[PDB]
Amino acid sequence: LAGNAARDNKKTRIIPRHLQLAIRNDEELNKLLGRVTIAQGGVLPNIQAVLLPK
């Protein structure tokens, strides 16, 4: 999954960002790794529906 994410990012080297994306996007891996934080991995992009403009 990390390699798939890195390919989607159009780069051939896996960095912590790809691992973070792979963990968070997959439900089971996120459930397993719920209480762990990936160093310099950030957070998924998310905007609440009510916060969008008109």
For position 46 contacting other proteins by CB under 8 A, the verdict is yes
Q: CA 5 to CA 20: how far, in whole Å? A: 10
Please report whether residue 11 would count as binding DNA according to CB under 7 A. yes
Cα 21 to the center of its chain, rounded Å: 2
Closest CA to 29 of 4, 1, 3, 6: 1
The item of other proteins, DNA, none sharing an interface with residue 11, based on CB under 5 to 8 Å by kind, is DNA
Q: List contacts with DNA (CB under 7 A).
A: 11-13, 15
Q: List contacts with other proteins (CB under 8 A).
A: 16-17, 34-48, 50-51, 53
